[PDB]
Amino acid sequence: AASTLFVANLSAEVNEDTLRGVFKAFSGFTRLRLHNKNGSAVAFVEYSDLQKATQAMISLQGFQTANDRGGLRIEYARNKMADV
DNA sequence: AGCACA
């Protein structure tokens, strides 16, 4: 089953391709969605299974495309990315 | 801390 990650601390100017380049570098990358609301943006990144998602989350934690200090803040998403 | 798409 595909496991989705939640990514915070993103600048509003970051590209979808740019962000893809960050996460596609890790094994099991399936798809990414970049969402914006009022200010800064967040992202949902899907991997082929949990182990690859965990592996990527640990590795990219605090990755320096950000607003605040600390770099990227990544969590497990509360829900899986919808099918299709 | 802040979690959408269908």
From TrEMBL:
Record localization: Nucleus
Start and end residues of each RRM domain: 3-79
Listed name of the protein: Mec-8 protein
Taxonomy of the source species: Eukaryota, Metazoa, Ecdysozoa, Nematoda, Chromadorea
